[PDB]
Structure 1
Amino acid sequence: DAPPLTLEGIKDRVLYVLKLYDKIDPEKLSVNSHFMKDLGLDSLDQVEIIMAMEDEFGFEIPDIDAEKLMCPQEIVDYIADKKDVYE
C-alpha cells in the first residue's frame, strides 16, 4: 500500500492534470506559469485547479492556503510540505 511520493512525481502529476484542462494549452504551461498574470486564467478557474489537485492527491487543501497557491510550483511545494516527501 501507499507508494512514496517524490517532487518529480508530484510535479509530473500536477502538470499532467494541468495539461488535461482545456483553458491551458500544453506548450505555454511550465512549472512557474502563474495562473493569473501569465496563463490568463480566472480566480474561479484557479479554485477549480486546487479542487483538481485535491481530487488528484486525495486530501483537502484549506481555503486560506488554497487562495495563496498561484503557480504549479507552489502547489507542488505545498503538497510536498503536507505529505513530507524526500524523507
Structure 2
Amino acid sequence: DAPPLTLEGIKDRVLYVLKLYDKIDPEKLSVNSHFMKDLGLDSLDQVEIIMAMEDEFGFEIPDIDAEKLMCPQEIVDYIADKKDVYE
C-alpha cells in the first residue's frame, strides 16, 4: 500500500497518454501547449481527455475545475497536488 510517484515520471505518463490520442499529432505535442488554440481540438474533446485521465488515475476532477486546465503543465501540477509527490 505504498505506490511511489515522481514528477518527471508522471509527466511522461500524462504526455504518453496524450500521445496515444488520435487527432493531435504525436510529433508536435508539447509539455507547455494550449488546448483550444494550437492542438486543434474543441471543448468537447478536451473534456474527453479529462474523462479518460480521470478514469486512468482513479479520482475525478470537477466541472467547476474543468473550466480552467487548458494546458498539460497545470494538469501535472493539479494531479501532483492531489498526490503530494515527494519522498
Relative contact order: is structure 1 or structure 2 higher (C-alpha 8 Å, sep ≥ 6)?
A: 1
1-side partners of 2:6 and 2:13: how far apart? 11
2-side partners of 1:6 and 1:64: how far apart? 27
| Residues 22-62 of structure 1, C-alpha deviations (whole Å, 9 max, x = no match) | 01111110101211112111000110011111012111111
Q: What does residue 21 of structure 1 align with?
A: 21
Q: Give the alignment's Cα RMSD to 1 decimal.
A: 1.2
Count of equivalent residues:
87
> Does the C-alpha gap of structure 1 residues 8 and 48 become closer, same or farther in structure 2, counting only changes over 3 Å?
same
TM-score, with structure 1 as normaliser: 0.91
User: Could you tell me whether the CA contact under 8 Å between 1:17 and 1:52 is conserved in 2?
Assistant: no
Identity in percent: 100
Show structure 1 runs of 5+ residues with no match: none
